[PDB]
């Protein structure tokens, strides 16, 4: 995903942007999913940084993923 | 001016195919950089430097004589304007319209044309902030 907001303490919200194909109108459609991802203090990702997240257990009400690598800018 | 208004006017300068100085001019590439950087110390903006070299020195297209462009020569020397030349003359136009409109409260046409120049200002300043020629906090006057 790409980092959307880092305003929470030690947790980021990533944004996963994808094109949804409609079988009727032979055309794609921009959709997105946002995920709250726990971010370790090993990492400091800014907004727009591309991260790799790995699924883990529930860590809060919404956190299922956990950042593994940050690709800067 | 096509962007605001109905004008389909096509009046431009058509640059030559043969991008080479004409061999009758013996001025060095080193001296043209001195003349370009000198005119900027007399307060001339890059569009005005090039006409003075075009008209009087015989240097059509400073890029062909010295391999880099006029504003690039100025940025290297530290003599670039603070805000770009496009944005300068649109702001300088927009303040001269507003100083008119403060005493002429019902100039209905110039209030319309002032919307159009400020729409050009907010649309260029979005370009220059994106391309980082302008600081992110820039924010035109009115």
């Amino acid at each position: 995903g790409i980092v959307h907001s880092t305003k929470m303490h030690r947790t980021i919200v990533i944004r996963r942007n994808y094109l949804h194909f409609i079988k009727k109108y032979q055309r794609y459609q921009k959709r997105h999913k946002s995920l709250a991802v726990h971010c370790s203090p090993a990492f400091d990702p800014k907004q727009g940084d591309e991260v790799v997240v790995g699924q883990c257990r529930p860590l809060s009400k919404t956190i299922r993923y956990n950042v593994l690598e940050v690709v800067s800018k | 001016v096509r962007m605001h208004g109905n004008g389909r006017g096509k009046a431009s300068s058509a640059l030559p195919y043969r991008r080479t100085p004409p061999a009758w001019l013996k001025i060095a590439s080193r001296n043209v950089v001195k003349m370009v950087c000198k005119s900027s110390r007399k307060g001339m903006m890059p569009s005005q430097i090039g006409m003075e070299l075009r008209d009087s020195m015989g240097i059509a297209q400073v890029k062909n004589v010295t391999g880099r462009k006029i504003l690039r020569i100025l940025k290297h020397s530290g003599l670039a304007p603070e805000i770009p030349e496009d944005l300068y003359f649109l702001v300088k136009r927009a303040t001269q319209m507003r100083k008119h409109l403060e005493r002429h409260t019902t100039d209905r046409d110039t209030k319309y044309r002032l919307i159009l120049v400020e729409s050009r200002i907010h649309r260029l300043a979005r370009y220059y902030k994106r391309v980082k020629q302008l600081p992110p906090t820039w924010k035109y006057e009115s």
Binding site: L19, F21, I22, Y25, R27, Y28, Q29, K30 | -
Partner: protein
């Protein structure tokens, strides 16, 4: 001047079509609930009712007759309607306070040609069929 291409323009085309299907009087009647809540039959067919009174409805121009029809009050929702009695005779088979089985006739509730403002039809009176009484297949109870 009509529609949009673009490989990523499907949300525009999906929204554009879902609003223009409401202009279709078949799509709008099949997808709004004023269709059944105002239909005197409860979105169904052949509703029963009780004969209240006999009416002679005069035919529209250029025809000239009076059409023999009863006004019945339905049992499932207590809605008063006027319904036509088809054949030569056949108000002689209907008396007041008779239960009658009333269908529409023809055109999905749009008043088959000559008769003004009547869009239903008697099928069966006193739980014996009304066309069977006409052809004398069988006769009325009691």
């Amino acid at each position: 001047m009509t529609k949009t291409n673009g490989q990523n323009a499907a949300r525009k085309l999906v929204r554009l079509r879902r609003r223009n299907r409401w202009a279709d009087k078949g799509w709008k009647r099949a997808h709004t609930f004023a269709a059944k809540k105002a239909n005197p039959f409860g979105g169904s067919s052949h509703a029963k009712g009780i004969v209240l009174e006999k009416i002679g409805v005069g035919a529209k121009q250029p025809n000239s007759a009076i059409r023999k029809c009863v006004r019945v009050q339905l049992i499932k929702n207590d809605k008063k309607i006027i319904a036509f009695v088809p054949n030569d005779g056949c108000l002689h088979f209907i008396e007041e306070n008779d239960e009658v089985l009333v269908s529409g006739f023809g055109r999905s509730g749009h008043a088959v040609g000559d008769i003004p403002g009547v869009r239903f039809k008697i099928v069966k009176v006193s739980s014996v069929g009304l066309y069977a009484l006409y052809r004398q297949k069988k006769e009325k109870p009691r």
